[PDB]
Amino acid sequence: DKEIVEEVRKLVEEAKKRNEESNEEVKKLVEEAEEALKKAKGEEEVLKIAKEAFELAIEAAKRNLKVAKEAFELVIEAIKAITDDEAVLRLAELAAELAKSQLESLLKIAEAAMRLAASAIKAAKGDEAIVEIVRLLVEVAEEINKASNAVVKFLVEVAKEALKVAKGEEVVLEIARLAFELAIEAAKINLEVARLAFELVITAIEAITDDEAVLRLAKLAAELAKSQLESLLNIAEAAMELAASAIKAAKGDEAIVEIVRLLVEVAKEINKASNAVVEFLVEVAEEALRVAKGEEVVLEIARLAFELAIEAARINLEVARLAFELVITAIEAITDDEAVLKLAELAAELAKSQLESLLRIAEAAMRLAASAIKAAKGDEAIVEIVRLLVEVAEEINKASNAVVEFLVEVAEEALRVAKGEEVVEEIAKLAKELADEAAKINEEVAKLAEELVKTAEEAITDDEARKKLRELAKKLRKSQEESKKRIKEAAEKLEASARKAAK
């Protein structure tokens, strides 16, 4: 019991002092390369130094996983024994502290690699050398996400094992709460390494002369942005299974509402981290549009940033769909009309989050195009930017509709189980408001898009381009009116469900 609770306690301490030595050997490793870069008078030699230095950091990241995986595998073993639920919780808190250490050590590795790339950029005179540096840094940061998610997948595995042994309810809520906070902590570690790597691409831009490399730094920025977004999506998928497994061993209804309530909060941090990395991506594009002197390059930047924004709305949508099936699952294990009414609210709260998240994506692609207009000269290239823009807007309506239909699908299940009359009435109340909040976003998006076509029409002369820009304005109002219709039809389908299920 305590003779093996003390054992894992001593295993975590050494694993944390190995991590403390892990990035210690990395800080010394970076300073050496910085000393060599400072003195090495070369250009193919600045790259070979950064290359093998980035590779040493990638290996040290794979080392931290070899420690954490062997350490987590041991914690699982000590859970196989131990009868006391009062001492599984001890073992569960020890695993959370361990994974928070590996992720802190992983962030510290990327920060040291972040320094090395900047040292490689000063001692690099050619544009071709700068771009090969950033392409090597994106390689390191992409393995930092992969190791960060691996630590998360192995922690939520430790939680799953401790849940099967858990007999008491309050022990389960603690296990769930402890491992949700780690997914949240890991979500912010991923956002930290994104902002760092994005600011390096900025300093890489400020050293570039040609317009060719500026496009290659935007492509390299778009690569990391999808990498950061899918890395957060995997985190969301990790907390989903932990939420489902925490419910299979959940005692009663109050424990399941609280498990879903904690689940929603994680899905929030995923939306707020997704938003923050999309804004960061747009600034790098804005820093790259300001310096671009050619329209053949300006178009390629906005088009790449809009693909990111579109893919952001789709990952915003999957995280919603992940959290919505889980809410449906929780309703299946609820016997109280009070705890099923409190599962519809937390669903309608996760819906308002995805829409405010969708809007912030839209607002980001707005100022992206706005900067593209100013960096564009000629009515033709201006219209194509608006074209690529309302494409983003059309995928904001569709993702909004899908967000509402997912919520109505959840209301349809809570209704079928709500055997009480005021519950049927309450579920319908809090549901139609998300449709009013949906049409409110659909109008906010349109106003935003309305300012942009007016902006484009001002910097336009060639009458034909005005006809093209007029066909897009008609296109945009068309898509948001359809989206407005597909939202009323959802509330109409749902208003005829409190009718059936109630007297």
Residue numbers in the entry: 1 to 503
Sentences from the paper on this structure:
Here we describe extendable linear, curved and angled protein building blocks, as well as inter-block interactions, that conform to specified geometric standards; assemblies designed using these blocks inherit their extendability and regular interaction surfaces, enabling them to be expanded or contracted by varying the number of modules, and reinforced with secondary struts. We construct twistless helix repeat (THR) protein blocks from identical straight α-helices (typically 2–4 helices in each unit); the length of the blocks can be varied simply by varying the number of repeat units. Restricting helical geometry to ideal straight helices with zero helical twist in principle considerably limits what types of structure could be built, but this is more than compensated by the great simplification of downstream material design, as illustrated below. Using X-ray crystallography and electron microscopy, we validate nanomaterial designs ranging from simple polygonal and circular oligomers that can be concentrically nested, up to large polyhedral nanocages and unbounded straight ‘train track’ assemblies with reconfigurable sizes and geometries that can be readily blueprinted.
To generate straight, linear THRs, we set Δθ to zero. This results in perfectly straight repeat proteins in which each repeat unit is translated but not rotated relative to the previous unit. We tested 33 linear THRs (with Δh = 0) with helices either about 20 or about 40 residues in height; 23 of 33 tested designs were solubly expressed, and 13 of 19 designs analysed by SEC were primarily monomeric as designed. Right: the 2.7-Å-resolution crystal structure of the tall, linear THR5 has a 0.6 Å CA RMSD to the design. b, Bottom: Comparison of the stair-stepping linear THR4 design model to the cryo-EM structure (determined as part of a nanocage assembly).
